[PDB]
Amino acid sequence: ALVFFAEDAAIIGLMV
Amino acid sequence: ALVFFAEDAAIIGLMV
Amino acid sequence: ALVFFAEDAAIIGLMV
Amino acid sequence: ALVFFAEDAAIIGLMV
Amino acid sequence: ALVFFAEDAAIIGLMV
Amino acid sequence: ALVFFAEDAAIIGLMV
Amino acid sequence: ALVFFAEDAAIIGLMV
Amino acid sequence: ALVFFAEDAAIIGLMV
Amino acid sequence: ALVFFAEDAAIIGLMV
Amino acid sequence: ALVFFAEDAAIIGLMV
Amino acid sequence: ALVFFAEDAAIIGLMV
Amino acid sequence: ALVFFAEDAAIIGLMV
């Protein structure tokens, strides 16, 4: 699965 | 909101 | 075109 | 992370 | 299917 | 434009 | 609702 | 950034 | 496949 | 139009 | 929730 | 990368 990154602060992973 | 990153060059934020 | 990034390991581009 | 809502009935969260 | 909601005014369903 | 809603806390609009 | 357009050939609407 | 187009009526831009 | 269009400037296709 | 598939049970089409 | 399928190899579910 | 499937006919891959 791919992991995208976003600033939520702190950077968080978004797993797909 | 979430801020994603993309190369547009320069790295820009993409807010959601 | 925009280029997003994801961890796939190694970081890969994703062009739009 | 954002939580979107959808009817699945009952309403469910969708966490991003 | 999932039914999301959006303001279009009136709140409409968006089926998936 | 459509306006979607998400919990972010508090509920926020997301315009499209 | 929003109507996007795409070539499918022929150009079609895509309603959201 | 990319600018997509949709009928909303009138044709509007959608900037990404 | 579907071909969407966006201004990038110049109008480009985006194939799906 | 493209038709994607999802388990909803039973597998359903999703046309685009 | 809908389950989409993708090849990651092996087929994996993607739950929405 | 992930490869999704859609009916386009024939079943085609859609790589991400």
Numbering used by the authors:
A (entry chain C), B (entry chain B), C (entry chain A), D (entry chain C), E (entry chain B), F (entry chain A), ...: 1 to 16
The authors write:
Amyloid-β (Aβ) forms heterogeneous oligomers, which are implicated in the pathogenesis of Alzheimer’s disease (AD). Peptides Aβm17–36 and Aβm17–35 mimic two different β-hairpins that Aβ can form, the Aβ17–36 and Aβ17–35 β-hairpins, respectively. These hairpins are similar in composition but differ in hairpin alignment, altering the facial arrangements of the side chains of the residues that they contain. Aβm17–36 and Aβm17–35 are cyclic hexadecapeptides consisting of two heptapeptide β-strands (Aβ17–23 and Aβ30–36 or Aβ29–35) connected by two δ-linked ornithine turn units that promote a β-hairpin-like conformation.
Aβm17–36 is designed to display the side chains of Val36, Leu34, Ile32, and Ala30 on the same face of the β-hairpin as the side chains of Leu17, Phe19, Ala21, and Asp23 (the LFAD face). The X-ray crystallographic phases of Aβm17–36 were solved by soaking the crystals in potassium iodide to incorporate iodide ions into the crystal lattice and then performing single-wavelength anomalous diffraction (SAD) phasing. The X-ray crystallographic structure of Aβm17–36 contains 16 molecules of Aβm17–36 in the asymmetric unit. The trimers formed by Aβm17–36 consist of three β-hairpins in a triangular assembly with a cavity at the center of the triangle. The trimer is stabilized by hydrophobic packing of residues on both faces and by intermolecular hydrogen bonding between the backbones of Val18 and Glu22 at each corner. Although the hexamer is not stabilized by hydrogen bonds between the component trimers, it is stabilized by bridging water molecules that hydrogen bond to both trimers. The side chains of residues Phe20, Glu22, and Ile31 form the hydrophobic core of the hexamer, with the carboxyl groups of Glu22 sitting at the corners.
